[PDB]
Design a protein around this ligand. Sequence first.
Ligand SMILES: COC(=O)N1CCN(Cc2cccc(NC(=O)Nc3ccc(C)nc3)c2F)CC1
Length: 974
Amino acid sequence: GDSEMAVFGAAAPYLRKSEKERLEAQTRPFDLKKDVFVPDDKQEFVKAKIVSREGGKVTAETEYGKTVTVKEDQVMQQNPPKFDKIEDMAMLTFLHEPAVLYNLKDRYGSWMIYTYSGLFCVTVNPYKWLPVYTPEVVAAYRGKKRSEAPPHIFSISDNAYQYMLTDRENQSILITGESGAGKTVNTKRVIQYFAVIAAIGDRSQSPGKGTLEDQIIQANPALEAFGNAKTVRNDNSSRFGKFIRIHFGATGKLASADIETYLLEKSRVIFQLKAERDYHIFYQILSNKKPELLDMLLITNNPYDYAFISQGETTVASIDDAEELMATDNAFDVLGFTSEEKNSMYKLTGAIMHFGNMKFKLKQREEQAEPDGTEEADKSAYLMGLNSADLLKGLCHPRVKTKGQNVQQVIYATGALAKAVYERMFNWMVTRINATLETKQPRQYFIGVLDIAGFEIFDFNSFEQLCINFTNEKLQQFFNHHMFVLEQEEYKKEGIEWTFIDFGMDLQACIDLIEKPMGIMSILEEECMFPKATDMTFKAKLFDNHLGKSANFQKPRNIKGKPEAHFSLIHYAGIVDYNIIGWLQKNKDPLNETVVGLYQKSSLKLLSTLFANYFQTVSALHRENLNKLMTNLRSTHPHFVRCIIPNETKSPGVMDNPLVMHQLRCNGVLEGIRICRKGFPNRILYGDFRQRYRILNPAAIPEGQFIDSRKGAEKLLSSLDIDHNQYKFGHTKVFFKAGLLGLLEEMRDERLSRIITRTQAAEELFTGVVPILVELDGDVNGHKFSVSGEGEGDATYGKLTLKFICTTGKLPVPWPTLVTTFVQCFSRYPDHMKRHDFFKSAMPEGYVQERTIFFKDDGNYKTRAEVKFEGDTLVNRIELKGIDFKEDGNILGHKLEYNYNSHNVYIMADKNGIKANFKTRHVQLADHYQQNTPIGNGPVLLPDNHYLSTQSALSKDPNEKRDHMVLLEFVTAA
Ligand SMILES: COC(=O)N1CCN(Cc2cccc(NC(=O)Nc3ccc(C)nc3)c2F)CC1
C-alpha cells in the first residue's frame, strides 16, 4: 500500500512502484498457453508468443519478431502478471532461468536495482545516481525485518547488525561479482552503514587521528591507491580480495577492526592491456600535486617515461589523479603512518618505476647480458638503499652454490622483483593499517564483510583463475550447506518428512579433486620441488593421476577460436578449460636471491622489512588463507549479496541477457534454485490454495464460512489425475514439486479457458430482446385447462413481460398459483457471477424443469416443462397435474389475492444439472421442489450455491375479453 512507502520520500520509486502502477501492470493481457520463453541462439532466452504446433514441435514468434520452432520440452512458462517485478523471486510460480532473468531485467528497467532471491540480495550496477542512500532512507530501514521493507542492501546490513546484537553471535556478509559488477561500492556502503549506526565505543593507546569509524573508512583511499586500477570494465576496480571484520565487545559496542587481503593482481604492476592503467598511485604521484615527491623520487612528471606503467592508458576522464593523491596522503595520516613510513613507500614506488627502465645488452660475442645504460639503475638502487654496482652485478651474475644470465632472463628477473616488492609492500601496509585499527579493547563478536572475485570463466583460464574458482567453490559449498540447514528447519516446522544428503556435498568432489593429497594443487606443489620438472611433466602427472579416475577431471574441450587448453574441470558453475603453461613457475615464484640478499641488507628499513622472512608456494599459502577464511566464516550466521554487471557499455537501465545469465549460473543464484528444487520448493498456505485451485473440483471444496482448508486441499488433490507423491501436507501449507504446481497452473488455465468460452456462448445467445412463447396443459382435479403466453425477454436487464390467456375459458385455479410455473434464463446475473448461469449454458438445447409444488392447505402440482430455443424464440412448454386438491380449499375456491411476493430461489447442483428449493406465500403456504437437467448431451456450467432474487408484477389489460394475466418480472442473481 502507498502509505507504507511514504517514509522513503524521493527514494520510493526506486524501491517499489505505487499500487496504482502495480495495479495496471497486473491487468495486462496474458495467456498462459501462448506467452512463453524459448531458447535463443544469440540471446540465451527470449519471450515468445506461440503461433502453432505439430508433431511435438512448437512454432512461436519471438519478442524480436523472429519466427522460430522448437521442441515442446524446450518451451517454458512465463509467470502471470501478478508476479511482475516481484521483490523476492522465491515466490515465483515458475522459477526457471528465464523467469529469474526477466524479473531482474523488468525491475532494473524501472530503476529498481535491488531484488531478493531466497537468501540472496541481488544488486544491479545502476550506472546512474539514485537517491536511495540518504539519511532518510537509513532511518527508514533501521530495525526492519527483510519482509517489512522493499529490497535494499541497507536491509542486509541492518539485519546482520541486529542479528549480532539479538543472537549474540558473529555474522558475515558475502559479496561477489565479476570485475565491475559493483562489489567494491557495495562493500563500502555496507561498512559506512555500520559506522553510522554502531554504538560507541568506550574510550581508552593506539595510532591514528579521529575515531575508529574514521579510521575504518580511511583504510579505503589508502588501499585503493595501491590495489585499484582503471580496467576496461571499471575506472576504479579492486584487483584484490578483501575480508574485513568489525569487532564488538560483550555489550554490543564498537571495539576494533581488522583487514585481510587476498590475491593481489601482481602482473598489473609491470604490464597493461591497451585500454587499462597500472595501479592508481603511480599516476597520483606523477600528478605533481605534491612536487617534493617528484624530486624525492628522481622522476619527471611524464608516465610515458616509464615502461612498467605506460603500456596502456595513462589518464582517465573520471579520475583527477591530483585530488586522489591528497586523499591517499590524507588517509595515511589518519591511519597514523609516520612521514618516514609514508616516504619509504613513495620511494619504493619510484624505485619500481626506474627498475623497468633499466636496459641490458649482449657482450661482444657472448650470450651474457650487461648493462646498456646505468642512470636508471642508479636512481633505483639509491631509493632502495642499495649499492648500484651490487644491484647490476646481482642481476647479471646471480649466485647459486655461481653465475650465468642472458638479456631475456635479466629482463624477466627484474620484472619478478618489481612485482614481489610491490606485493609485499601491499601486505605490509595492510598489517600497519591493522595496527592502527587494533585498540586492544575486548572483542566478543564480529561482523565480517567478505568481498572477493566471483566465479568467472574466461576465454583463457590459467593458474590464477583456478585459485579464484577453488575459493568460490568453497564459498558456494558454504552457502549450499547453510541453505540445507534452513530447508531442514522449514520442513521440520511444517511437519514434512523429507531429507536429502547435505547440499554442500554436491561440491565436495570438485573440492577434493583440487585440494586433497594427490589432488591438482598437491601435484603442482610436489612437482615444483623437482628441479627437472616441466610444464609437460606436470600435464602428465595430472592425467596419469586423474584422467579416468576423477570424473570432475576431463580432457579440454578445445572450442572454436579459443586458445589452447590442457584440461577441463567440472565446477558447480560449469566446465572450465585450464591452460597449464607456466604453473610451476607461477607457483614457486622464483626470485633472484642475490638481489633479494641485497634487499634484506638495504639501508632503507622498509625494503629490509619486506624481505626479512624469506619455503612456501603460492598454492600452499592460498590454502592456508582460505582455511583461515573458512574457519572464520563457519563461525558466523551468513548473508549473501550478489552484484550483477548488466551490460558492457556502462549503460543505465539496459541488460544483455547472455552476460547476466552467465553471472546467474556462476554466482550461486541458479544454484540456490536447483538445490531447493530437489525437495518441494513451491509452498502454498491452505487458504490461498482453495482460493486459486478450487475451480479444478469445486465439489470437494464446499462454500460458506467455517471451512476446513486442509481437508479441502486433501480432497481436491486426491481427486485429480496427478502423481499424488509430488505434494505433502504440512501444518499450514501444501508443499509441491515444481513440476506438479506447474501442471496445476496449466489445468487451471485450461478449466478457466473452457468456462470463458461457455459463458460467452451463453450471453450472445440472449443478447437483444428475445421472443417468448409459453404453453401450459393443466389438469387439476380431473378438469383440464390450457393457457398460452406470448411476450418479450431481455436478460441484460433481467426483465420479461408476458401476456397469458386461458384459451379454454375461466381458469380452474387462481392466476397467482401459476407464476412459478410460467424461464429463469432471463435472470440478470451480475458481470461477475456469469459462470454460475446454468440456465443460459444449457441453451439452445435447453433444459427440463421438473417441479413438485406442495400447497399447505390443498393438494399439489407435478410440473414438467421443457425450456428450449425454437427458432429465434424461447419456448417454455409446460404440462401440469394438480391432484388431491381440496374442492373447498383456498386454491380451488379462488380465495387468493391478485398479487405476488418476492422469493429467493435456492439453487444447488447435482449430476448434469441443478436443483432448487423455495416456498411461496400468497396467505397460503406452498413449497417447491425444482430439478433442472440439460437436454443436449453437451457441457453446462454447474454453479456454486447461490440464490435468485425475483420480483413479479401482476396486472390486467383493460380491453381483454378472454380471462388473462399480464406479467412483469424482474430477476437478478445474488
Ligand atoms: C536464489 O535462489 C535460491 O537460493 N532459492 C530461491 C528459490 N528457492 C526455491 C524455494 C525454496 C523454498 C521455498 C520456496 N518458496 C516459498 O517460500 N513460497 C512459495 C509461494 C508460492 C509458490 C507458488 N511457490 C513457493 C522456494 F521457491 C529458495 C532459495
